Amino acid sequence: MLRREARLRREYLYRKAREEAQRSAQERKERLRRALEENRLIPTELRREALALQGSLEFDDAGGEGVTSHVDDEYRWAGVEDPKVMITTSRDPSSRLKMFAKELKLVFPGAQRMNRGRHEVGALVRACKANGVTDLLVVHEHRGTPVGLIVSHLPFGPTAYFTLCNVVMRHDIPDLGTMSEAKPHLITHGFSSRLGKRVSDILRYLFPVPKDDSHRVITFANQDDYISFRHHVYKKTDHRNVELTEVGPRFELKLYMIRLGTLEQEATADVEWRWHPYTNTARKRVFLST
Amino acid sequence: TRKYATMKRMLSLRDQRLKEKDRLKPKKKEKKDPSALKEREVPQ
């Protein structure tokens, strides 16, 4: 199994290297295909090798997988199987942190929370991979308030680092009751840039495919690179009029890191994107919106 | 006494009973002898 995991990773990185070549290889194919379909001069860059493209074009069919994308390879079983999420905390947690980790279990369908004792960081990733855990969440705290969040996709998936800003928990609010706990509908709003499409994908795949008539709503709203997490359930009193009742925790997120590897590989994994605060134009730039 | 990974005796590609075009390579490594004189053609 250890050799299998090492073998698969090299295939994953190796395919990532040639994704740019294959996109360039594909893009020049349609221009020739457009050139033959509508009788017009073949572009001079395609003037040579034109017959070779035609032969591969004639081979092209629906059966082939097509051009490879690293996002698809990372999230291979996103739709077919329901995700399995495990939630843990840092060593020696506070009382309020153990409340927060208890609430994230209810938010994510099918999540489980395990006590972090003396478990080294490396061993947890090994155990999660062995038992088929899809996603791993690690949460930090400062003076009884959660302050950091890490989301990791176990099969050599991307690792996303977050910092929390305005956390309000249900345990603060009296006599709320019990949650609906049904499979939720997802509302993603404000993500427009290419990186914004990347980040919204990571957050969406933490959830299973819901039912059509589900009344549970989870909203991720981006406003000036700050993502707002909101949890609501609605009741249709009558046509065109809807009532919203808030349930669940309320907190904000700020992304500053995405790494290709897992949280066991800080020393080897490459950085897809980092937040650089000491750039001269750092204060006047946003990345999740265009 | 026993041998392993044996292969049948076949023609080699460096045999001179082949033509020069067909021959693979002379497989010769040349080393500049320190005692050897360096001679060059440099027009004045």
Binding site: M1, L2, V80, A130, N131, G132 | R2, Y4
Partner: protein
């Protein structure tokens, strides 16, 4: 005779009560057949395309289980409903074998990571046990009462464990007993090959006082489990037209250039029908088909005991 399966069948089992036979195949399917109406009434397949290596069915007959060559995980289905109840994970490497406890309804599976794992089915908290071994495991069998367990390991030892207490009751060393002979094409001698071969088939007697072990040889060894001694050795065959039967190859056939086995190989493959293909161990396309090796693929003992 049932021909529903397309590829070879790796394992087969009867249910404990009914006249029902369950098979697992390389097709990726586990099929159940009834003898009352002679039909394949239930077929189980994995959500993922995988090949199964063995089958095990509970004594009650409600639970059907199978293990894979590659996906490294045990699949468990329900007999009456036919849906995938669960996927048991934790092993590393292929699963060598499975067996249900006849009286307790727990599943024991051996794998190539030097481990044998016990799974509890009708347990609210999903208790699991691991049994670590010095070398890779190959087979697992329960005694008829179900209070003792036997594991064959790659170093040719049979270890007897107590499943409920996870304690090793005993061990049996069996490397010397498996007299193995050299094949015609082997460069190495009999002893060097024997140092790398172990038992691969085990079966308890009806009473359980003796154990039968077999592998790639013409001998089946019957051991007394409590004394850990070899009571008897049975010779399966004396046919010398089968490969690897005799330990020392005849000196008469040797010449200066070797025993020249390929001449006889071509003479034997002159049967035609197919074309021998390089790299096939078994089958029509295998070159070494006219004189196969002697191997005892499996052993079983009658529940009657006669």
């Amino acid at each position: 005779t049932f021909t529903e399966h397309s590829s070879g069948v790796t394992g087969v089992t009867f249910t404990a009560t009914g006249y029902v036979v369950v098979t697992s195949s390389m097709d990726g399917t586990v099929r159940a057949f009834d003898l009352h109406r002679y039909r394949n009434f239930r077929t189980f397949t994995s959500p993922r395309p995988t090949q199964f290596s063995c089958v095990a069915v509970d004594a009650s007959g409600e639970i059907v289980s199978a293990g894979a060559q590659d996906s490294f995980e045990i699949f468990v289905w329900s007999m009456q409903t036919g849906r995938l109840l669960d996927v048991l994970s934790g092993h590393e490497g292929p699963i060598s074998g499975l067996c249900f406890n006849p009286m307790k309804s727990v599943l024991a599976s051996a794998s190539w990571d030097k481990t044998v794992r016990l799974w509890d089915m009708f347990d609210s908290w999903r208790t699991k046990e691991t049994l670590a071994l010095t070398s890779d495991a190959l087979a697992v069998t329960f005694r008829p009462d179900g209070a003792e367990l036997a594991v064959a390991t790659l170093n040719s030892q049979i270890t007897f464990w107590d499943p409920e207490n996870a304690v090793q009751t005993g061990s049996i060393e069996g490397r010397h007993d498996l007299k193995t002979g050299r094949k015609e094409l082997d460069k190495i001698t009999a002893k060097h090959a024997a140092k790398g071969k172990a038992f691969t088939a085990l079966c308890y007697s009806a009473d359980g006082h003796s154990i039968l072990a077999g592998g790639m040889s013409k001998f089946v060894c019957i051991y007394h489990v409590r004394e850990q001694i070899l009571m008897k050795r049975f010779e399966i065959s004396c046919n010398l037209s089968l490969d690897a039967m005799e330990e020392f190859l005849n000196r008469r056939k040797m010449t200066e250039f070797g025993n020249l086995a390929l001449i006889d190989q071509d003479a034997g493959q002159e049967d035609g029908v197919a074309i021998p293909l390089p790299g096939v161990r078994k089958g029509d396309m295998s070159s070494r088909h006219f004189k196969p090796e002697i191997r005892v693929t499996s052993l079983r003992f009658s529940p009657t005991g006669r």
